[PDB]
Every structure is written in C-alpha cells, then in structure tokens.
Design a protein around this nucleic acid. Structure first.
Ligand SMILES: [K+]
Ligand SMILES: [Mg+2]
Ligand SMILES: [Mg+2]
Ligand SMILES: [Mg+2]
Ligand SMILES: [Mg+2]
Ligand SMILES: [Mg+2]
Ligand SMILES: [Mg+2]
Ligand SMILES: [Mg+2]
Ligand SMILES: [Mg+2]
Ligand SMILES: [Mg+2]
Lengths: 47, 59, 118, 73, 133, 175
RNA sequence: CUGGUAGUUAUGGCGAGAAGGUCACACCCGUUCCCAUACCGAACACGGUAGUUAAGCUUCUCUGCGCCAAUGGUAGUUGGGGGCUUCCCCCUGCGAGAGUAGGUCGCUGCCGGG
RNA sequence: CUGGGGCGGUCGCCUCCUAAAGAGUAACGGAGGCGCCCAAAGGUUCCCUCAGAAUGGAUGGAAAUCAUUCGCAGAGUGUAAAGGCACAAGGGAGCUUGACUGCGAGACUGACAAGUCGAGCAGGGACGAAAGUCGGGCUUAGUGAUCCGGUGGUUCCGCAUGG
RNA sequence: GUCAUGGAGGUAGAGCACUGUUUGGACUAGGGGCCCUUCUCGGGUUACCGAAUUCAGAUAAACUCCGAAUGCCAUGUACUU
C-alpha cells in the first residue's frame, strides 16, 4: 500500500493524491475527477 | 424461468419393457424414438427397467 | 411450512420509504395502496395527519379500464386533477413499499403528466 | 505494564434544554446515538448533534427507550 | 473455596457499609449463624468453621455455606518499598456485612445445632448471633 | 400434469373426507421439492463440483445453485465462502414431473426398499428422502460419470401433522 | 361496518379461545406481455376471479406471559449535629430499587367506499 | 520520571475502570489496543436479516451443505474497548468515484501550537422515476512541527536594460 | 443567593434482565467406575464425574431490567444581593 498521485490527462497538473494497494491494484488507477483548471470532470490517471 | 441457462425440459414418454406400461413425464435426454400412444402429439421414448407396477415390493 | 404475509412484509418496506419521505403543508406525500383487484391514491400531510385529495379505481367518476395499468393511469390523471382543484402543486411520491415499476409507476407517470411537480 | 490512558474527549451536552442557540451550535458530543437528531438538528460524521437553525433546544423522549434533541424557533 | 476463574486478577478492597442486601433470613436450614458486625471472612476461616461444625454433627444433618470468597486480595513482600504496581494475589475473602447469615444447618436437634454453631463462631473473626427459622 | 391432475381429481376429497377439514384450503398440498448434493470434498478440488452440478442439473431439468459454506471449520478443513454442495428448488408442474419420476421410474432401481420410513418425518409435516447413489435416476448414465456423490431430496408439505403428510405422500404413490 | 393512512413510553405486545366474508381485503388461478429468480412466476411483476374463509385481516372474549402502577415502609442521601469508629447513631429536607393493592386484551385522528 | 539514586520499567496516540450520575481529575493504580487497512470494506438505489438449538436426511463424523420450527439479537459491525446499530450502522445485488474544487454562518475543545463538528453558498458531477443522499469508511487510534533539500505547476519578482 | 420550571448525566442504593463469579435441590443428555456375548455398540448397575434445564438462593471497580440525594446546564414577567 502506497501513496499515489493522479495526473489530469488534459489539464496536465496533478492535484489529487490517493492511496492504493499495489499488489491488488498493480495497474495505474484511472478515476474521473473534477479538474479545477478546466472546471469540469476529466479522466485522471496514476503517474 | 430464465432462458439459455437450464437444459431442455422437453416432454418424453417412459415405457417399462416387461409390463409394457406408458406414461408422459417431461425430462432431459431425448434419445429420439417415436411413440405409439398419442402419436399426434409426438414425443420421444425411453426404454426403462421395471417400474412401480412391475417391481415386486409394490405389487 | 408458513405462507409469508405479503402486506406485513410490504408494510416493512413502506416504513423504510417513510423514513426519508413525509408530507408537509407546503409539499404533501402522494401515498399509493395496491390490491389484487384495484389501486388507491391519497395526498397526505403527516405534520397535520390529514388526507387532502384522494382517488380510487372504484369512484363513480372514471369507471372504464382495459388493463390494471390503464386503470391505474386513470387514477393518477384524476388525483392530479382533484389536487390541482384543491390548489396543491409539488408532492413527493410514496411508493407505499411497492417496486416503482408496473401499476404504481403508471399512477406516478400519469399524475406527473398532469399538474403535479415531482 | 499498565500506565496508559487516552486524552478525555469532553463528550456530553453542550447546550441546556430551554436555551436559545444559533445555527451550527453543537448540542451534544457523543459516540454513536445516545441521543438522536430531532427537528432542525443534524448528526455530524462523529455523531455530534448540531442545530441547523437558530431557536430553543428541547431534549425529548422518542419512544420508551430512545431520546432526541430538537431546536424550535 | 476459590473461584474457578476471575475476569480480573486484582480488585479494589471495597467497603462494608450497611446491612447485607441479601441472605439475612435463614433459607435452606433450621438454624443459622448470623454476622452481627461486618468483616472480611477468608476462605481459610470458612474451611476451619465448616470442619468444626460438620465434625460435631458427626456427618449428620446438612450444612449450607451461604458466603463465598469471590474477592481476591494482594500483598507486597517484606523489604519492598511502595509503588512499582499492585502486589500479587495472596488470598480470597467474602466481605460479610452485618445481618448476613454465613452458615445454615438442619437435620440435627436444637442442642447439637446450637453447639456446632458456637464451635464454628470461635473460628470466625466476626461477632455472631445464632438465629433459627 | 399426470400427477397434479390426479391430486385435483381423486386425492383432495378422498383426503378431506379422511380428516374432515372445514375448507378445501386446509387440504395438504406439496409446496416445493428441494434436492441438495453436499459436495464437501470440493474443498480439495473444484472440478469435482462442476461434475456434481452438471449431473444434478440433468436429474431436475433445472440448473442448480452452488451453496457456499457459512462458518469456518478446521475439522473438515473449511473456511468462509468456498463452494460446498448444490441446491435446486422444484415448484409447480416441473416438480410433480420429478415426484412422479421419483415414485414411478427412479426408486425401483435401488437394490431394495422398506417404504415411507416412518422415522424420516421432521415432526412438522415434511419428508426427507435419503438417496444413497445417483445411478438410481435414469437421466444419469453411470458409464458417463466418475464418482457417485449421492443426493438428499426434501419434500415440503402444507400438512400440519406427519399423519396428514404420510397420507398425502402415500396417495401420491410414494411407497 | 370495512379498506387505506397517521399519532400515541406494549395499559397498545405475546399467547389462548370464538365468530365473520362477493362490498372491500386476502389467500387463490395463470405466465402471453412489461418485469423477475446468483436455481425456482416461492418471492417480485403482469393478467385473471373457478374455488375458500383454512390462514392473514376484522370484530369479540380472557390476565397465562409480558407491560403499566399507587399508598405505606425501608435503603441511600443534601444540610446540621454526636460517637466507642473495618464503621455507627440523632435532627431536618429529599427519597428509591424490590415487593404489593391495583390497571391493561388500547386510546385518539383524517380519507375512501357501505 | 523514580516513595533516595542505580538496576529494571516507562516516554506519543486510542478505549475502559479508578472518576465521587455534567465536564475535568493523580499514582512506577487496574485492564487492553495503535504507528494500519479497504478500488470496496467508499457513494447511491433497490432488496434483505443474524447466533444457536431441536427434528428429519447419501457421502458425512459433536460440527460442512439441504429442509421445517423456535429464536430482540444470545450474531455481525476490517481492527482494542466503550458508546451505538435489526426504519439497521449488520447482509446481498445494479450503476458508480462526493475517498469532489472553491469555501463556510456558527459552535466544541483549548495556555499556545494544534485538534473537532458544521448547516448553507458556488462550480461541476454519481446514484435515484422522484424526494433526496454523497466533501470516504457505525463512531472515537493509524501519527511528527519548523529549518533545509527534491519534484511538478505558476496571468509573481528578476539588483542598469533584455534575458 | 434562593424560589419555581425544564433538561443532560448512570454514582449511592438496589437488582439479577445481560456478562462474569457462586450455593443447594430436582431433572437429564453424555463420560467414568462394574460384569455380560461385546467392537463396553446397547443394557442391568450407579450420588465416581458431568453439559444443559429449571426451582430456590447469593455476588460485582472495569454487570445493569432499574435508579436517588446532591452537584451541573439553562429559563423567569419571581424575591434578595
Ligand atoms: K468470633
Ligand atoms: Mg486521564
Ligand atoms: Mg469520517
Ligand atoms: Mg521512601
Ligand atoms: Mg527508590
Ligand atoms: Mg463524570
Ligand atoms: Mg528552495
Ligand atoms: Mg536585470
Ligand atoms: Mg453498590
Ligand atoms: Mg455498579
């Protein structure tokens, strides 16, 4: 289990830190999160 | 009843070979054999070992 | 073996619904009761504990249906109308514990089609 | 092997029955619902009961075994 | 007499204010030994009192012990200063409050009952009265 | 449909006339037949279960539901979840079909039988037919199967007393 | 009178017994359609009304269990005093829990049909 | 720190008893936990009810999986304990990422540093027919300041001026 | 400060509804002594043990179906200060 940062795919910035178990979730996590820069929801992916 | 989950329920006639009785009762496993009884409503056929009528405990 | 009392278990589900939903003078509860035969609607204030508008499948007005769903649409149409006449607009739908699906849905869809804002 | 204890968490009533409160006033700090959110009262994430509007606090019986706190303007 | 197990190995000494809340009227027997003042009764004292009673009755009649030593007590050895945590469990006591019937006997004549009970009373650290149902 | 018809034609009055029921509603009927397999060995190998389900399906003409263990038991080497045994609930026409094939074709394929074992009523009104082996049922073909497992057949009645139940199972034809 | 829906710390619950039904309400009959089952039209959903009050429901009866509950007394105790003190006693005010006399097989709305 | 000091033990955080029916309250007093975990064990919609026992039944044993009955909870609630929870806060399933961004009347706690709760507003969403709920998890542990360094961003500054 | 009114809170006491500790009796499934073909499987035996079950009776800082006095928070158009 580790700290993770999600990067906005459009915005570019990474203003979402999360955590995951990297044994159970070895792939890069993708969540739809609001991007404040774009002021809309965007796909965010683990770095 | 869900579809594409269970096998066929298709009707079928059981007949004991010895006593030579016949009755309708739906089941799996066709075998593909014609029947005499109610041939209009054609069903498969199943040859069977002694039934209730035949078995000696019963009769 | 014991037969389950369908209304007992229904009334249990209705409690779960009435946990979040309660009529107020500004915005009352459109409660539905469904039988094997016919359906019934009441627009209620839980604060006062008084039924305002109400409508059944066996009132002298509208006594001609094809299916129980069509019958239940006539009730929505009538309870909406009778409510508008009384001068009440915004209700909240109380499923009564019934799955929001066949009849009870058709009662709501219909009531909602007329002047009732939910 | 003993000698440990956590900091006391100052639970319990923070406003009196019959006292006027402003919106957001914490009424009761508690673990779980010793007392339930009544009318114009909210339950916070840690079970803290707070007034949602200004008014007078009233601790009331719910039914036999339970208790609620309400805020009446 | 020792509890088979206890939730807690160490326990407050407690107090002995008031009349015993229960066991003040003789219940199972004809004659009873009643505590007149409060005291801790140790399991060693209950046994000494039991054997004194029972021996005089010569395995005749019945003897009910109505007190049980539920409460542990601890001690520190000699040559040990104060502090460093509570002492090890040493023994078992029954806090007996005034009015508590401690022993009951039946199935012997008054004279023998009254004698067995005085013999028991002389093993107990508490002023006693003999009472009959 | 061969047996249900019979149950509605000349069991109901016959059985109502025997006990003197006030209404025909009081007459005992069969609610559900429930077959249970009980594949415990499955804790070792899962493929053993797949067969035990597929074979049980053919017997009932209705895919079963793989029952999963409730509490962890070291003795049987068992832990929460993990599939052990398959259930299947027969109701309505497709049930009577089974009951018929159980009393007409299936049971006289065992080595012998005493009959409706008086000892095998729960005391409420329901009968549990303990089935030794699965080659008793003609839709199985033992020349196409590996292991026998066995089976458990539960017959649930509306009956109140074993006496009332016994009569119903008897007049339905069960030995 | 009955169906719906509320309030009220079970005096309202549980259990036992009895009666009732085309007006409802039920069970009940069926799976073509919407929709269902980790299998099952059991349930949910839909369409029916041959059969039945057996059950639920409704009404009535009962104190067996529960629940409610005085008065009196007692324990405890604020304050004020005394002792011989593991503790105990007196004055004043408050005053349980248990037990008991007793109570209860509910009460109070709004809407629809009769 | 310490019933002299040393030796031993302890040092922060959570729960309970001590604690004298608000809150708080000491001891090298009595008991236990923590330095995480979970992509669902979060959100929402819908549906549900547990432990155990009795009786009957193939492998099958005291105990596996069926079935009926009785069962206010004798279960469960990731994890100690306490307080809660059966309109469930417990158990299934469908869709999801609110385990959101900007905040925040007002309160609690408190020497300070910190800590806690928060309706509601705006943006843009998830689930839901709607009502609505959602700023992680039944609640309360799971953490560590400043300084200094690293990385990403940036309508800021740039020592004459442009860099 | 007192009076009146409302409220939160589980101590004293009490109780045994739960959890732990516990006595006696009745009941009763097992197990252990004692012979029998016997595989002591089951009888005929039993106060050698023993888990539930009830009847009566105790007990608790970390038990509670209950529950004070006080103290505490507040309100008052009350009386004093
Ligand atoms: K003495
Ligand atoms: Mg402290
Ligand atoms: Mg939280
Ligand atoms: Mg010293
Ligand atoms: Mg020293
Ligand atoms: Mg306190
Ligand atoms: Mg720098
Ligand atoms: Mg420059
Ligand atoms: Mg006490
Ligand atoms: Mg206590």
């Amino acid at each position: 289990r580790v700290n993770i940062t999600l990067e906005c795919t459009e915005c570019g910035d990474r203003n979402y830190i999360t955590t995951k178990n990297k044994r159970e979730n070895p792939e890069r996590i993708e969540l739809k999160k609001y991007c404040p820069r774009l002021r809309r929801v965007t796909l965010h992916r683990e770095t | 009843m869900k579809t594409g989950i269970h096998p066929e329920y298709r009707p079928v006639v059981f007949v004991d070979t010895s006593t030579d009785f016949k009755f309708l009762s739906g089941s799996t496993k066709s075998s593909s054999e014609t029947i005499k009884w109610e041939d209009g409503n054609e069903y498969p056929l199943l040859r069977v070992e002694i039934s209730s009528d035949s078995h000696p405990f019963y009769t | 073996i014991t037969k389950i009392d369908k209304n007992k278990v229904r009334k249990k589900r209705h409690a779960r619904v009435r946990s979040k939903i309660s009529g107020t003078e500004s915005r009352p509860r459109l409660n539905v009761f469904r039988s094997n035969k016919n359906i019934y609607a009441q627009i209620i204030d839980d604060v006062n504990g008084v039924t305002l508008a109400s409508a059944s499948n066996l009132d002298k007005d509208f006594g001609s249906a094809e299916s129980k769903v069509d019958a239940a649409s006539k009730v929505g149409e009538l309870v909406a109308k009778r409510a508008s006449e009384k001068g009440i607009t915004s209700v909240t739908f109380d499923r009564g514990g019934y799955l929001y699906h066949g009849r009870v849905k058709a009662l709501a869809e219909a009531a909602r089609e007329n002047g009732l804002e939910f | 092997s003993n000698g440990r204890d956590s900091e006391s968490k100052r639970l319990g009533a923070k406003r009196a029955d019959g006292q006027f409160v402003t919106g957001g006033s914490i009424l009761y700090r508690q673990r779980g619902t010793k007392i339930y959110p009544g009318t114009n009262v909210g339950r916070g994430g840690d079970d803290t009961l707070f007034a949602k509007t200004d008014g007078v606090v009233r601790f009331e019986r719910m039914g036999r075994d339970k208790k609620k706190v309400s805020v009446y303007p | 007499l020792v509890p088979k197990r206890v939730k807690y190995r160490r326990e407050f000494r407690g107090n002995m204010r008031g009349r015993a809340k229960g066991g003040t009227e003789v219940a199972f027997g004809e004659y009873g030994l009643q505590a007149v003042e409060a005291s801790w009764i140790t399991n060693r004292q209950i046994e000494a009192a039991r054997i004194a009673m029972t021996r005089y009755m010569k395995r005749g009649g019945k003897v009910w012990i109505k007190i049980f030593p539920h409460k542990s007590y601890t001690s520190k050895p000699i040559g040990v200063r104060m502090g460093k945590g509570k002492g090890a469990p040493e023994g078992w006591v029954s806090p007996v409050k005034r009015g508590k019937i401690m022993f009951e006997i039946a199935g012997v004549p008054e004279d023998v009952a009254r004698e067995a009970l005085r013999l028991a009373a002389h093993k107990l650290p508490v002023k006693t009265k003999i009472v009959k149902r | 449909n061969r047996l249900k018809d019979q149950y509605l034609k000349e069991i109901v009055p016959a059985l109502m006339s025997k006990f003197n029921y006030d209404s025909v509603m009081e007459v005992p009927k069969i609610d559900k037949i429930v077959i249970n397999t009980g594949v415990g060995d499955a804790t070792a190998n899962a493929k053993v279960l797949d067969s035990a389900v597929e074979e049980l399906a053919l017997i009932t003409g209705q895919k079963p539901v793989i029952t999963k263990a409730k509490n962890s038991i070291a003795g049987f080497r068992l832990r929460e979840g993990m599939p052990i045994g398959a259930k299947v609930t027969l109701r309505g026409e497709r049930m009577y079909d089974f009951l018929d094939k159980l009393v007409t074709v299936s049971l006289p394929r065992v080595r012998d039988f005493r009959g409706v074992s008086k000892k095998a009523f729960d005391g409420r009104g329901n009968y549990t037919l303990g089935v030794r082996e699965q080659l008793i049922f003609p839709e199985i073909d033992y020349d196409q199967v590996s292991k026998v497992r066995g089976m458990d057949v539960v017959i649930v009645t509306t009956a109140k007393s074993d006496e009332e139940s016994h009569e119903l199972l008897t007049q339905l034809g069960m030995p």
